[PDB]
Each structure stands twice: as structure tokens, then as C-alpha cells.
Design a protein around this ligand. Structure first.
Ligand code: MET
Length: 493
């Protein structure tokens, strides 16, 4: 069984969880579940990034230690994962001892390759981004203060600092981008990165000089928060122990991240991995941002699956998008409550009332029967091709187009009228509808897991007949008992 490793960015837990974090986790969860159902051996990581100057300063404001703050706020992030029904296999915190040892190992690996030196710089520095900047990347605003590109103040500094020889990787990075056209996506991101690297790379500062991982052999220094943070992805697999059973999951198939942190993952990270003699992830994919506050309240007001569906359907993955009360209510009423849920309820109640709650024996399929059935099978192939490109909206779009067409099929067959005229044919039509519903049910599991389970329970589908392979392999059999149908998607109160 082919191995598939997917990760989310690890959030700074310096406050409460926000919807950005929830969005990223839901989308990564969907992708992970999709691949499980598609027959892969999946490892799915998320976690928290607990070092950094931004954590230090938040700790000071609250008047506690950064470990204290990290420990307190992290519980909320873990609780968010449980509430969003996240299927992650591990949870990483960069305060753990395994990470400390991982980060010091990858560091040593880069030193062994000759890519790390101690040196002197003189330039603008932002304390909060732990990064130097060139005068060109800065501006003096009306308050008379010079700001760097990432929004924060820069001051002039002359210090010794450890450096990574990022200049030695310009050409190897450009080859990576030619040879692997899907390494950093979507396209708008690819071009930012390719252009940034074509225009020249300066060596990168990777230490400062008391909350972080000490640079091995020189404890007066601590590792820049990004070197540390990126290592999370290989820490979770047992690095540096390459005989750990998890290690075969490396290289990651997909790092899901937000667009504001592309450069770290598509430039720094591969450079570091090359240096440490490790293989590179197959893809980094950057989602956009959401605009209107608290994920827990949203789940409470709308339902988890309603929110999951909305976010993954209404925004093209990669692009920025909007959400509002009215949008979520209307789109989830239309697609879930009405289109899918009411097709299930009407059809399954007709089977309950008119066929003794047994799946009816289908006869010859008509042209219209074969068309809707085939459209369902076709949706699986489209969903697969979509998810390979992180196109969650297209995967869901294809599956729900089958739902829309199934309502038209149902209405147009007029099965109530057939009750009197032709009960054999009524049965065939109810069969088809039930069978289309089984195929949809299987396909939507990754996106709306609990609701999908409830819809398949209603269709009496065994627990071991809900893989994507079962869409073609395991059709409903006439005669099977079905429990009394309750609505799966209540209309919004
Ligand atoms: C190695 S992913 C680190 C992400 C970072 N803590 C952020 O939230 O921006």
C-alpha cells in the first residue's frame, strides 16, 4: 500500500485559535481522508510552533514564561483539532525533547556539508521577524520609523551570527523548479518564488543571541525560529533515526501552508534538506486567506460539516475568499439540507412506506438510469484528478453536480405516479436513486465525515464497504433491510 504523508503549518500558539488555523486544518484533513479512502497508507501531522521572539513578547505582556504560555494556549489548539474532527495521526509541539534533538541533528548535518559559518553582518534587522533586510525592501513611514516588508520595525545592527550558505543553492533551486513544475503551487506562488530566486540569493542568518533551541557547540546562540520550525516535519517521523518505522513516510507528499509563509517552505526548506542530504517534498501548496471570528462558535452556530463543506466548496483552494452568515446559511441549506438531504429523505421514505423498508429489486436500466449512474462513477475519477492538484472545490463541485442531476432524475421519473401504473419500474427508480446516493455517500466522506457516515448507515452499507474501490465494486443488493430514515442535514434554524 503506497505511502502518503501530509502536513499542516504549525501555528504559533501565542493567542486563541482563529479561523485561518481551522481552515487549514479542515482542508488538510479532507485531503488526508481522501487518500485513506483511495487506498493509501497515510500519515497526517499538525502541531504548534512554540519558540520565537513573537512568543517571548507575548509571554512578557501577559507576565508569564513562554513555556507557561505555550503550555496554556496549546490546549486550545488541541481542542480545536478534536472539534473540527481532525484525523491527524500525531501532534507535534516544538518544545518536545524529540524536536530539540531533531533540530540539533539537522543543524549538524548542514555543518558537516559545509553550509554553516559564524560571521559578521551590518544591516537593517527586525527583532520580531528574526531576519535582516536590504534597504530596498524597507520604507520610512510618516511617523519617521523604518519598516521591513513583513510589517514590523527594523533597526540597524552590527553583530556576529551563524549563517546558512543559501547563496550556494540558487542554481539547484532553479533546477528543482524546472524539473518539478508542481513543487510550489498554485501558479501565482510559483512565479513569486521563481522570480525571487532568479533575482539572487544572499546567505541567510540562522541564529540569534533565550527561548529556542541552542545552537550545538555554542549555547550563547539559539536557532532562528524557522530552522527549528521547519524541522517539525521530519521530527514527527523519528529524525535523525532513519531506521524508525515512520521514516519511510519521508519525503512529504504535500505541505499545506498559508501564502504568507511560502518563501520559508519553497526556498529555505529545500535548501536545508539538500544540504542535510535529504529528499525534497513533492509539493508545497499555499492556500489563501479568509475574510468576514472564532472557530468554536462557528461550529456551534452552523454545525461542523456545514462549515467544512462551505469553506471547501465556496472558495477555490489557493485563492482568497469571503464568508458571511447569509452565505453559509444559503449555500448549506441549498446543497446539503435541500439537494442532498431531501433527496435522501424523500427517496428512502418511499422505500420505507412502499417497499417494506427493503432495497427494491431493479429491472432493466433505462437510458436516463444509466446516465445518472455513470455520472456518479465519473465523479470519482474527476474527484481523484482534482485532489491530486489540491482542487478541493472542483472535487466537491463534481460530486454535488451528481446530486443536482439526481434530483432532476428523481423528479422527472415521477415515482409516485409509477406506484399505481408500474410498481416494478417504481422499484427500479428507487433502487437507482438509492444506489446513486450510496456512491455519493462514499465520495463525500472526507469532506463531511459524520454526515456521510449517517447517510451510509441509512443505506445499510457495511463498515468495510466504504472505500472508494467500493463505488464500482459493491452496489446495493435488492432485498437488504434499511433502517428508518432520519434527516441527515437539518435546515438552518
Ligand atoms: C514550519 S510552519 C511555521 C508557521 C508559523 N509558526 C506561523 O504560524 O506563521
Amino acid at each position: 500500500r503506497e505511502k502518503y504523508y501530509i502536513t499542516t503549518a504549525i501555528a504559533y500558539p501565542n493567542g486563541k485559535p482563529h479561523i485561518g488555523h481551522a481552515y487549514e486544518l479542515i482542508a488538510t484533513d479532507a485531503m488526508a481522508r481522501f487518500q485513506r479512502l483511495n487506498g493509501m497508507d497515510v500519515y497526517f501531522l499538525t502541531g504548534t510552533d512554540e519558540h520565537g521572539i513573537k512568543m517571548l513578547q507575548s509571554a512578557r505582556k501577559e507576565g508569564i514564561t513562554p513555556r507557561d504560555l505555550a503550555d496554556r494556549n496549546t490546549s486550545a489548539f488541541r481542542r480545536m483539532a478534536e472539534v473540527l474532527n481532525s484525523s491527524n495521526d500525531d501532534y507535534i509541539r516544538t518544545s518536545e525533547e524529540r524536536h530539540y534533538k531533531a533540530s540539533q541533528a539537522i543543524w549538524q548535518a548542514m555543518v558537516a556539508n559545509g553550509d554553516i559559518y559564524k560571521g559578521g553582518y551590518a544591516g537593517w534587522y527586525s527583532v520580531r521577524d528574526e531576519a535582516y533586510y536590504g534597504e530596498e525592501e524597507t520604507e520610512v513611514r510618516a511617523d519617521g520609523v523604518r519598516y521591513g516588508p513583513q510589517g514590523t520595525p527594523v533597526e540597524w545592527v552590527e553583530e556576529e551570527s551563524y549563517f546558512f550558505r543559501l547563496s550556494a543553492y540558487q542554481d539547484k533551486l532553479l533546477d528543482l523548479y524546472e524539473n518539478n513544475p508542481g513543487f510550489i503551487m498554485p501558479a501565482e506562488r510559483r512565479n513569486e518564488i521563481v522570480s525571487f530566486v532568479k533575482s539572487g540569493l544572499k546567505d541567510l542568518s540562522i541564529s540569534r543571541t533565550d527561548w529556542g533551541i541552542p545552537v550545538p557547540g555554542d549555547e550563547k546562540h539559539v536557532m532562528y525560529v524557522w530552522v527549528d520550525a521547519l524541522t517539525n516535519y521530519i521530527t514527527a517521523l523519528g529524525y535523525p533515526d532513519t531506521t524508525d518505522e515512520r521514516w519511510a513516510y519521508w519525503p512529504a507528499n504535500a505541505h499545506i501552508i498559508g501564502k504568507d509563509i511560502s518563501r520559508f517552505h519553497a526556498v529555505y526548506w529545500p535548501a536545508f534538506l539538500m544540504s542535510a542530504q535529504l529528499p525534497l517534498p513533492k509539493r508545497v501548496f499555499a492556500h489563501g486567506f479568509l475574510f468576514n471570528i472564532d472557530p468554536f462558535e462557528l461550529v456551534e452556530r452552523y454545525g461542523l460539516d456545514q462549515l467544512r463543506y462551505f469553506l471547501m466548496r465556496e472558495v477555490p483552494f489557493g485563492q482568497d475568499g469571503s464568508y458571511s452568515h447569509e452565505a453559509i446559511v444559503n449555500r448549506t441549506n441549498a446543497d446539503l439540507a435541500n439537494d442532498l438531504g431531501n433527496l435522501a429523505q424523500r427517496s428512502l421514505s418511499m422505500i420505507a412506506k412502499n417497499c417494506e423498508g427493503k432495497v427494491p429489486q431493479p429491472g432493466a436500466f433505462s437510458e436516463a438510469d444509466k446516465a445518472i449512474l455513470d455520472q456518479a462513477d465519473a465523479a470519482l475519477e474527476t474527484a481523484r484528478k482534482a485532489m491530486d492538484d489540491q482542487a478541493l472545490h472542483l472535487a466537491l463541485g463534481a460530486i454535488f453536480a451528481v446530486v443536482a442531476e439526481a434530483n432532476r432524475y428523481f423528479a422527472g421519473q415521477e415515482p409516485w405516479a409509477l406506484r399505481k401504473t408500474d410498481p416494478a419500474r417504481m422499484g427500479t427508480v428507487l433502487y437507482v436513486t438509492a444506489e446513486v446516493l450510496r456512491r455519493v455517500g462514499i465520495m463525500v466522506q472526507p469532506f463531511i465525515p459524520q454526515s456521510a457516515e449517517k447517510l451510509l448507515d441509512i443505506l445499510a452499507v457495511p463498515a468495510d464497504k466504504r472505500q472508494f474501490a467500493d463505488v464500482l465494486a459493491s452496489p446495493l443488493a435488492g432485498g437488504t433491510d434499511l433502517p428508518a430514515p432520519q434527516p441527515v442535514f437539518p435546515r438552518y434554524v
